[PDB]
């Protein structure tokens, strides 16, 4: 019966969600719980870099009004 | 278990399983035995289930099933296709026309067996060897492929 | 760099396979049609290029000229195609 | 509806002995289906019949673990079936 | 016309093909929004708007962004 | 961590590649009244790994008349480009997001046509050269409409970055609009992966050309490549035209639906293969240059006009 | 012109075919098919074998239409013996003859598609084909290569359950033709691959001796089953499916219709099969019954002589043609008074058809040739003999 | 009685409605979608394949299969070397030479069926007066070496003893027919 | 057979035909094996009188 084709599809599927969940949590871990900034245009890289200089060395650390 | 002998027995068991599970056969398609296998490829006795490829080019074929009479004009070819198949390769002779000359044994245009042209591993008997009968023969090839111990021989050589 | 890292792993994975694959085991076919296609292909491929900047050009303040230009390009090439059809070309 | 099919499925799985049995069948016979034992020959082969299924698959044999010495756990071949029970399996005679 | 008909039923791609070619060559000419594209894109502020000195002779320029003077995009709003 | 991510994208995809093969051999089976491979392993799950091992062990054959590089470069290039094109794909977050992402995918695909050309010249047998020339032509032709169909899309997306479409398709799939091209993207995706309706690249009844002289490890690498592509192109359909729902709070329902739509459209080309006879070589090019290219070029203009007079010019960035 | 041979191993070559093609580019300008790769010496071996022991050879000439082939030898030998089969036997030969044309057509239509690239039609029908062989096996003991149709009458009576089982197969078979009907008859891809390919004009078809669906496909109205009714084809009603134009599509459509028309003939045979004996009662021609040879001396003598020596058919020569599924299959049996034949020229619908490939495949691509061989339903056993 | 297949009875003049219906057929591949539906339908049908080792394709009593020589219930082999099984074999497979046994009975010193030569016609089954040579049910006798396929009297007699119970049942079922 | 109604309905529709009425797989409709013993009829020429071969 067709249901036997499912085992194979399942294994494919599980192996196609891993990548999307993986890439989207190894980003939120490396960037400090905040989505990796996407610097499409320089302004953004500038702002990002500015952030680095503002604190520690990493941009993800984010200083606030209390600074 | 711990012994260079045990590791070399288990790993061929692995190598033999891979060749056994995936035999991609290449049928020349001589005479009528090819039909009695087109029935094996068909739904009542699927061959793919067992890991058998319905259609495989010589260079990608593990098993050659010679179905049908090997005339003296197709002999020079069979050998070529057997010679051009990849090394790990096996031959299954199907039909009393191929394993022996069968009706047409005494003909002037029929080779009396493909064993004369290509070394043969399993001989499947029957004028139209039944399709289960070919499937039993292919399964017998799988039993022969399980028994082979190439790695063991290299170790104790 | 991040891309470089990914790509070299990509080549490595493929070279690894072929290497194991080779290590574990231990004259005049010519039809102008074919050449003609290749040519047409680039004439179209070049056009694809002149059409690729259209996403940035959409935001151009002119707009009228943009479309007037783009429509002329697509129309003149298509006519090229038209004549390709009319002529034995594209009729293999 | 769907529950019914799942139910009959459970019956099948739970039917062939414990998990041990299911694995014995799942891996060597490649079919978890339950039928009525129509007999056990002196070699050890066990024959079953499920008239509900199509003609092709209403009569099956679950070969033995060892025949004439040889281990037949995985290396099962058809000829293992005894000549007496061969015709019953091939539907030559409808009588066990 | 008759061929047109068969063309609609035989080789019914070109017909559609050309039809679109034209409909794209017309809608822009006649539409209540075509003008907006050159405006909506014109308005989008990408480069800093440099302020002009106040000679004090200009009543048109707004002295402050929020002033009631200057350009507005309420057309963009409620568009 | 980046490597971890590199591994998370490539390894799973490769495994998915393998099981697609199994799934292709069971869905085609049940459609043809046969169980398909279930005897090796449980329900055939170990079947893909089994022939992989058989293929690598069998002797790679270097024809007497064969280049030894344009022969080994060709499968390496095929696997490298296909696995590489999974690098910049939104799921929803891309591993290496590239501002000109779709141009990367179009360019990388284009490079695979060489592997076919190089393998055909390398074999030095007539069947290979004839097959390669027709093949390169098919692939290239189906690139010209393939590219124009994307340019129509982009102009309604605003950018070349595949990441933008997740924000473009937050209210409706791009199938509703632009369905006429989806179909034409789907058929072109079928040609570029040399799948069935368009499998003349390597027709079997016709020239049993691409892998004629390729066995064992080389066979496998392209092989792997084709199937990974089969997925990738289907996945690009599932981002560009069928936009999976995106919620910024939970990113995986995007990937969960991406999983579901990709599998169904991957299932569709499997279903197409069993259902249709293969087109003739010229019948294939007759479709693209006569039937599709005029449709695509005109609908391309409609997609430069729809934005302007509907005052909908898409926001860059 | 880049000479290239369609070598035997290739699947589209039916196992044995070496079509020397001259490729003027992809367009093929000339074909020189080199058959002979399966010539077994079938007709020089028959001269050394008695009439019964040569029957088997006729099941192997066209190997996809076994019984219709052995109905041509059986009719010939019967003519030369001025004996006629009993009434039940003639219906059984017509019943088995149409099961064979359904069997050949399922072979021809599905394998043609396998060559073009459609793979599923073959699997659906091949399951319906093993259902059919079973009927051969249940009546003769061999799935194919039965030897059931004997030179005089048929060999053994139908088992007591066969006609019910043939009804159940015929009852549901038409839906199965209907199903590939939907999957491969309107697909633009099939029509394009098949329509307007290998057109053969009516007079050219007669001149090239095509004599088959190839004759009927171009509109010539000739069926040896209605024109020269052999066996009982005079008491069964059917419509010859004449095609109009001759493209490989019209020929496909004709083959699908003949499968449907054969179901109409099979229906009549089950509905009207007479009670009676299956083999003529002359012990001189057909062997005596098992009980009789073991209780009556005249029967043992007749069994001993018939099996050891033979019928000894009277001296003469005959050309008997029957409509085999491929086309007109005829045996020119020349007979001396001896029990073993002198000559047996098997006319093969197929020797003529393959000759037509060069003319039919004119101005055609490499791919068209694969369709051209497919639409001739050529089995090289009949051509090579 | 004839029947035109693919002959258009008349020229239906295009009507917009007709044209649209057709154009839609070409543009939206309507018939192609029809074909996909058929295959999806079977995907849901039960597959017809049989587990080959566990289940076997049905063969009725007349199946010819593999040659065997039977023996009388007493234990005397049935063959009396009349040698017409040799005479009617089409392939020249059976070779028989005989001499009067010590008992004085007629028996075959050598009976060799060359199975590779045999084409399993089943005439030998037919010809034997004592019905000593029978077509046995077994079809699975594939052999690694060509010599094993050649069969002498001892293999066939042994084949006969192994399958006698089923051979007797099969002959029992079909003898009235013969 | 043995298919949940819904699958059957999908089957019948996708195919466009009542495939259930004419299933290909055979179930308890096929002639049972061991059909009764057959007493076949003896044809003409078995008369014990006026059966001279010279006349037939
Ligand atoms: C996935 C969700 C469940 C799918 C499902 O249940 O399908 C069967 C179920 C019944 O389908 P069917 O074709 O009537 O099944 C044939 C018999 O009726 C029912 O067949 P049966 O009479 O043989 O019933 C017993 C069967 C019953 O098994 C089932 O019906 C459940 C199968 C679940 C597969 C998951 O259990 C078995 O025979 C052993 C196999 C069990 C499943 C093996 C594959 C599991 C894969 C797991 C990873 C994926 O499908 C539906 O209820 C409608 C699905 C509509 C989809 C559109
Ligand atoms: C004529 O040449 C042939 C073909 O080309 C047309 C075939 O497609 C086929 C048919 C082949 C198939 C569909 C099955 C083959 C499938 C495979 C090789 C895929 C197996 C999976 C893998 C390679 C493993 C996945 C990747 C890895 C190497 C490691 C994973 C990390 C055959 C048999 C053939 O001979
Ligand atoms: C990862 C790539 C694959 C590696 C091996 C995967 C598992 C192989 C396996 O499970 O074998 C099952 C196979 C199952 O097939 P089998 O050889 O037992 O025979 C099959 C019998 N019937 C037909 C009933 C199914 O068993 C073996 O191969 C035993 C040896 C395995 C050795 C593996 C370790 C080395
Ligand atoms: C649940 C699974 C559903 C499967 C549906 C297809 C198989 C069943 C078909 C049954 C059948 O025979 O009817 C076909 C029917 C049969 O019709 P016909 O060809 O016999 O004739 C009817 C049409 N006229 C009369 C005008 C000629 O075909 C159609 O109804 C038209 C189909 C048009 C398809 C256009 C291309 C596909 C859609 C592309 C746009 C994207 C759609 C969504 C894609 C996926 C998004 C997630
Ligand atoms: C931008 C891209 C636009 C398209 C670019 C390419 C166009 C190429 C057109 C070539 C037409 C001539 C031709 O060669 O084709 C004739 C066609 C048969 O074509 P075919 O069988 O494929 O063979 C081709 C070689 N003869 O047989 C034909 O006669 C086809 C006729 C096609 C035209 C039919 C009428 C089309 C216009 C219908 C308008 C309907 C109302 C539209 C309203 C629009 C409002 C804005
Ligand atoms: C095998 C041959 C094909 C190899 C795979 C195909 C690779 C195709 C690469 C296309 C260009 C990629 C690119 O442009 O990305 C540039 C990347 C980010 O740049 P950008 O998009 O502008 O973003 C800036 C703000 N975020 O940042 C970069 O600057 C990346 C710079 C190039 C990275 C290339 C990675 C290695 C690929 C070359 C490997 C060479 C060895 C193999 C040679 C094969 C020869 C046939
Ligand atoms: C404003 C627009 C109004 C409506 C416009 C409709 C546009 C349709 C877009 C595609 C157009 C395709 C087409 O025109 O047909 C070409 C060909 C059939 O054309 P043909 O019969 O060869 O005509 C000969 C004339 N030279 O078409 C083909 O050959 C199709 C071959 C298909 C082989 C695989 C088919 C798979 C079908 C199922 C999947 C369809 C896609 C569904 C998924 C899409 C993405 C979700
Ligand atoms: C139906 O016609 C024929 C075929 O093509 C579909 C063949 O493939 C073949 C041989 C094919 C193979 C490789 C089994 C034969 C013998 C044949 O008769
Ligand atoms: S063996 Fe019997 S069946 Fe196979 S080919 Fe020779 S004759 Fe035809
Ligand atoms: S016929 Fe029967 S008995 Fe006479 S020899 Fe041959 S086998 Fe022995």
Curated annotation (Swiss-Prot), chain B:
Cofactor binding note: Binds 1 [4Fe-4S] cluster.
Organism domain of life: Eukaryota
GO molecular function: 4 iron, 4 sulfur cluster binding; metal ion binding; monooxygenase activity; NADH dehydrogenase (ubiquinone) activity; quinone binding
Cofactor or coenzyme needed: [4Fe-4S] cluster
Catalytic reactions on record: a ubiquinone + NADH + 5 H(+)(in) = a ubiquinol + NAD(+) + 4 H(+)(out)
Record PTM: Hydroxylated ar Arg-44 by NDUFAF5 early in the pathway of assembly of complex I, before the formation of the juncture between peripheral and membrane arms.
Coiled-coil boundaries: none
EC nos: 7.1.1.2
GO biological process terms held by the UniProt record: aerobic respiration; mitochondrial electron transport, NADH to ubiquinone; mitochondrial respiratory chain complex I assembly; proton motive force-driven mitochondrial ATP synthesis
Keywords per UniProt: 4Fe-4S, Electron transport, Iron, Iron-sulfur, Membrane, Metal-binding, Mitochondrion, Mitochondrion inner membrane, NAD, Oxidoreductase, Phosphoprotein, Respiratory chain, Transit peptide, Translocase, Transport, Ubiquinone
Positions that bind [4Fe-4S] cluster: 32-33, 97, 127
Location(s), subcellular: Mitochondrion inner membrane
Any one Gene Ontology cellular component term annotated for this protein: respiratory chain complex I
Described function: Core subunit of the mitochondrial membrane respiratory chain NADH dehydrogenase (Complex I) which catalyzes electron transfer from NADH through the respiratory chain, using ubiquinone as an electron acceptor. Essential for the catalytic activity of complex I.
Protein name in UniProt: NADH dehydrogenase [ubiquinone] iron-sulfur protein 7, mitochondrial
Swiss-Prot record, chain E:
Superkingdom, natural source: Eukaryota
Main location per the UniProt record: mitochondrion
Recorded GO CC terms: mitochondrial inner membrane; mitochondrion; respiratory chain complex I
Signal sequence range: none
Keyword annotations from UniProtKB, A to Z: Acetylation, Electron transport, Membrane, Mitochondrion, Mitochondrion inner membrane, Respiratory chain, Transmembrane, Transmembrane helix, Transport
Record's bilayer topology term: Single-pass membrane protein
The UniProt record lists the keyword Protein transport: no
Entry keyword annotation includes Ligase: no
Transmembrane regions: 14-34
GO process terms (BP): aerobic respiration; proton motive force-driven mitochondrial ATP synthesis
CDD domains: NDUFA3
Sequence segments annotated as region (Disordered): 54-79
Cellular localisation: Mitochondrion inner membrane
Subunit and interaction comment: Complex I is composed of 45 different subunits.
Biological role: Accessory subunit of the mitochondrial membrane respiratory chain NADH dehydrogenase (Complex I), that is believed not to be involved in catalysis. Complex I functions in the transfer of electrons from NADH to the respiratory chain. The immediate electron acceptor for the enzyme is believed to be ubiquinone.
Entries under PANTHER family matching the protein: NADH DEHYDROGENASE [UBIQUINONE] 1 ALPHA SUBCOMPLEX SUBUNIT 3
The family this protein is said to belong to: Belongs to the complex I NDUFA3 subunit family.
Protein name: NADH dehydrogenase [ubiquinone] 1 alpha subcomplex subunit 3
Curated annotation (Swiss-Prot), chain H:
Residues that, per the record, bind [4Fe-4S] cluster 2: 89, 118, 121, 124
Domain annotation 4Fe-4S ferredoxin-type: ranges: 70-99, 109-138
Topology class, membrane: Peripheral membrane protein
Keywords: 4Fe-4S, Electron transport, Iron, Iron-sulfur, Membrane, Metal-binding, Mitochondrion, Mitochondrion inner membrane, NAD, Oxidoreductase, Repeat, Respiratory chain, Transit peptide, Translocase, Transport, Ubiquinone
Keyword Ligase annotated: no
UniProt subcellular location: Mitochondrion inner membrane
Binding of [4Fe-4S] cluster 1, residues: 79, 82, 85, 128
Cofactors required: [4Fe-4S] cluster
Record text on cofactor binding: Binds 2 [4Fe-4S] cluster.
Keyword Oxidoreductase: yes
Oligomer and partners: Complex I is composed of 45 different subunits. This is a component of the iron-sulfur (IP) fragment of the enzyme. Interacts with RAB5IF.
Family (UniProt): Belongs to the complex I 23 kDa subunit family.
Name recorded for this polypeptide: NADH dehydrogenase [ubiquinone] iron-sulfur protein 8, mitochondrial
Gene label: Ndufs8
UniProtKB/Swiss-Prot annotation, chain I:
Compartment(s) of residence: Mitochondrion inner membrane
Modified residues (N6-acetyllysine): 39
List of residues that carry N-acetylalanine: 1
Function: Accessory subunit of the mitochondrial membrane respiratory chain NADH dehydrogenase (Complex I), that is believed not to be involved in catalysis. Complex I functions in the transfer of electrons from NADH to the respiratory chain. The immediate electron acceptor for the enzyme is believed to be ubiquinone.
Entry's family note: Belongs to the complex I NDUFA7 subunit family.
Subunit structure: Complex I is composed of 45 different subunits.
Name of this protein: NADH dehydrogenase [ubiquinone] 1 alpha subcomplex subunit 7
Full-sequence range covered: 2 to 57 of 113
């Amino acid at each position: 019966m067709w249901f036997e084709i499912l085992p194979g599809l399942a294994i494919m599927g599980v192996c196609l969600v891993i990548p999307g969940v993986s890439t989207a949590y190894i980003h939120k871990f490396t960037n400090g719980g905040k989505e990796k900034r996407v610097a499409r245009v320089q302004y953004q890289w500038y702002l990002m870099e500015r952030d680095r200089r503002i604190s520690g060395v990493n941009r993800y650390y984010v200083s606030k009004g209390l600074e | 278990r711990s012994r260079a002998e045990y590791v070399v027995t288990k790993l061929d068991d692995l190598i033999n399983w891979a060749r056994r599970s995936s035999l991609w056969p290449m049928t020349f398609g001589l005479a009528c035995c090819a039909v009695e296998m087109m029935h094996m490829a068909a739904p009542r006795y699927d061959m793919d289930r067992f890991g058998v490829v319905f259609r495989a080019s010589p260079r990608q074929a593990d098993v050659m099933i010679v179905a049908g009479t090997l005339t003296n004009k197709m002999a020079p070819a069979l050998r070529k296709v057997y010679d051009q198949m990849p090394e790990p390769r096996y031959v299954v002779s199907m039909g009393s026309c191929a394993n022996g000359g069968g009706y047409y044994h005494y003909s002037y245009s029929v080779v009396r067996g493909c064993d004369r042209i290509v070394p043969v591993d399993i001989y499947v008997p029957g004028c139209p060897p039944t399709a289960e009968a070919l499937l039993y023969g292919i399964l017998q090839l799988q039993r022969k492929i399980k028994r082979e111990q190439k790695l063991k021989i290299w170790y104790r050589r | 760099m991040n891309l470089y890292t990914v790509i070299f792993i990509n080549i490595l994975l493929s070279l690894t396979l072929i290497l194991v694959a080779f290590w574990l085991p231990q004259r005049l076919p010519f039809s102008m049609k074919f050449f003609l296609v290749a040519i047409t292909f680039l004439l179209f491929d070049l056009e694809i290029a002149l059409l690729l900047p259209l996403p940035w050009a959409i935001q151009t303040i002119k707009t009228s000229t943009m479309m007037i230009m783009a429509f002329i390009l697509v129309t003149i090439l298509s006519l090229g195609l038209a004549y390709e059809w009319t002529q034995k070309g594209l009729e293999w | 509806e769907l529950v019914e099919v799942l139910k009959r499925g459970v019956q099948q799985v739970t039917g062939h002995g414990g998990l041990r049995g299911l694995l014995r069948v799942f891996f060597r016979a490649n079919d978890i289906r339950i039928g009525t034992l129509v007999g056990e020959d002196k070699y050890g082969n066990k024959y079953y019949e499920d008239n509900k299924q199509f003609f092709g698959r209403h009569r099956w044999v679950i070969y033995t673990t060892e025949m004439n010495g040889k281990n037949t756990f995985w290396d099962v071949d058809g000829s293992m079936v005894p000549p007496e029970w061969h015709r019953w399996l091939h539907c030559m005679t409808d009588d066990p | 016309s008759a061929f047109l008909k068969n063309a609609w039923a035989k080789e019914p791609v070109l017909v559609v093909s050309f039809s679109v070619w034209g409909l794209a060559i017309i809608m822009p000419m006649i539409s209540p929004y075509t003008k907006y594209a050159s405006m909506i894109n014109k308005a989008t502020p990408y480069n800093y708007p440099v302020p002009v000195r106040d000679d004090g002779n200009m009543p048109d320029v707004p002295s402050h962004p929020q002033d009631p003077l200057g350009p507005s995009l309420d057309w963009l709003k409620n568009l | 961590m980046f490597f971890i991510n590199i591994l998370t994208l490539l390894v799973p995809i490769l495994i998915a590649m393998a099981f697609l093969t199994l799934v292709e051999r069971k869905i085609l089976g049940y459609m043809q009244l046969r169980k398909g491979p279930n005897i090796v392993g449980p329900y055939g799950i170990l079947q893909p790994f089994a022939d992989a091992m058989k293929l690598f062990m069998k002797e790679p054959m270097r024809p007497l008349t064969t280049s030894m590089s344009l022969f080994i470069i060709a499968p390496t290039l095929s696997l490298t480009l296909a696995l590489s094109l999974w690098v910049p794909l939104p799921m929803p977050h891309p591993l290496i997001n590239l501002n000109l992402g779709i141009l990367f995918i179009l360019a990388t695909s284009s490079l695979s046509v060489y592997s076919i050309l190089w393998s055909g010249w390398a074999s030095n047998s007539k069947y290979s050269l004839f097959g390669a020339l027709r093949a390169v032509a098919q692939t290239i032709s189906y690139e010209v409409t393939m590219a124009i169909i994307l340019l129509s899309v982009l102009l309604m997306n605003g950018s070349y970055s595949l990441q933008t479409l997740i924000t473009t398709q937050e209210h409706m799939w791009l199938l509703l609009p632009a369905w006429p091209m989806a179909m034409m993207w789907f058929i072109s995706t079928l040609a570029e992966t040399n799948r069935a309706p368009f499998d003349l690249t390597e027709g079997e009844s016709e020239l049993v050309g691409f892998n004629v002289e390729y066995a064992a490890g080389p066979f496998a690498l392209f092989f792997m490549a084709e199937y990974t592509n089969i997925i990738l192109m289907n996945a690009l359909t599932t981002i560009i035209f069928l936009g999976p729902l995106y919620y910024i709070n939970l990113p995986e329902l995007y990937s969960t639906n991406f999983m579901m739509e990709a599998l169904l459209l991957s299932s569709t080309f499997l279903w197409i293969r069993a259902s249709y006879p293969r087109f003739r070589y010229d019948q294939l090019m007759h479709l693209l240059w006569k039937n599709f290219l005029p449709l695509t070029l005109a609908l391309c203009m409609w997609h430069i006009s729809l934005p302007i007079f509907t005052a909908g010019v898409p926001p860059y960035m | 012109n880049m000479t290239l041979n369609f070598g035997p191993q290739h699947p589209a070559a039916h196992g044995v075919l070496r079509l020397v093609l001259e490729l003027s580019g992809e367009m093929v300008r000339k074909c020189d098919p080199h058959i002979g790769l399966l010539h077994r010496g079938t007709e020089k071996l028959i001269e050394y074998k008695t009439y019964l022991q040569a029957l088997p050879y006729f099941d192997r000439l066209d190997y996809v239409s076994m019984m219709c082939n052995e109905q041509a030898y059986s009719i010939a030998v019967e003519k030369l013996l001025n004996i006629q089969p009993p009434p039940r036997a003639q219906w059984i030969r017509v019943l088995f003859g149409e099961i064979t044309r359904i069997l050949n057509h399922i072979m021809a239509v599905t394998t043609h598609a396998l060559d073009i690239g459609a793979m599923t039609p073959f699997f659906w029908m091949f399951e319906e084909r093993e259902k059919m062989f079973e009927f051969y096996e249940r009546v003769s003991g061999a799935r194919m290569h039965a030897a059931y149709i004997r030179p005089g009458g048929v060999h053994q009576d139908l088992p007591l359950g066969l006609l019910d089982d043939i009804y159940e197969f015929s009852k549901n078979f038409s839906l199965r033709i209907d199903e590939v009907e939907e999957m491969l008859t309107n697909n633009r891809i099939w029509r394009n691959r098949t329509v307007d390919i290998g057109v053969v004009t009516a007079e050219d078809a007669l001149n090239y001796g095509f004599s088959g669906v190839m004759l009927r496909g171009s509109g010539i109205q000739w069926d040896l089953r209605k024109t020269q009714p052999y066996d009982v084809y005079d008491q069964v009603e059917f419509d010859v499916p004449i095609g109009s134009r001759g493209d490989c599509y019209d020929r496909y459509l004709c083959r699908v219709e003949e499968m449907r028309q054969s179901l109409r003939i099979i229906e009549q045979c089950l509905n009207k099969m007479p009670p009676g004996e299956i083999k003529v009662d002359d012990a001189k021609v057909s062997p005596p019954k098992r009980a009789e040879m073991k209780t009556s001396m005249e029967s043992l003598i007749h069994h001993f002589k018939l099996y050891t020596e033979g019928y000894q058919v009277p001296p003469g020569a005959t050309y008997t043609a029957i409509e085999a599924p491929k086309g007109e299959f005829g045996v020119y049996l020349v007979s001396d008074g001896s029990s073993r034949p002198y000559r047996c020229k098997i006319k093969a619908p197929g020797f003529a058809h393959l000759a037509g490939l060069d003319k039919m495949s004119k101005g055609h691509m490499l791919a068209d040739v694969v369709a051209i061989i497919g639409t001739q339903d050529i089995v090289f056993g009949e051509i090579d003999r | 009685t004839y029947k035109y297949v693919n002959k258009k009875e008349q020229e239906s003049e295009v009507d917009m409605k007709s044209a649209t219906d057709n154009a839609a057929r070409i543009l939206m591949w309507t018939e192609l979608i029809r074909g996909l539906g058929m295959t999806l339908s079977y995907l849901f049908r039960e597959p017809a394949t049989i587990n080959y080792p566990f289940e076997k394709g049905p063969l009725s009593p007349r199946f010819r299969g593999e040659h065997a020589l039977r023996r009388y219930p007493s234990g005397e082999e049935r063959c009396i070397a009349c040698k017409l099984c040799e005479a009617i074999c089409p392939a020249q497979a059976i070779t028989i030479e005989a001499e009067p046994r010590a008992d004085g009975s007629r028996r075959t010193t050598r009976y060799d069926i060359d199975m590779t030569k045999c084409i399993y016609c089943g005439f030998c089954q037919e010809a034997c007066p004592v019905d000593a040579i029978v077509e046995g049910p077994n079809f699975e006798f594939s052999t690694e070496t060509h010599e094993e396929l050649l069969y002498n009297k001892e293999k066939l007699l042994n084949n006969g003893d192994k399958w006698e119970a089923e051979i007797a049942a099969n002959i029992q079922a079909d003898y009235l027919y013969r | 057979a043995s298919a949940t109604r819904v699958i059957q309905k999908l089957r019948n529709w996708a195919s466009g035909q009542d495939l259930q009425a004419k299933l290909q797989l055979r179930y308890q409709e096929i002639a049972k094996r061991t059909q009764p013993p057959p007493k076949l009829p003896v044809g003409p020429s078995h008369k014990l009188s006026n059966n001279y071969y010279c006349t037939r």
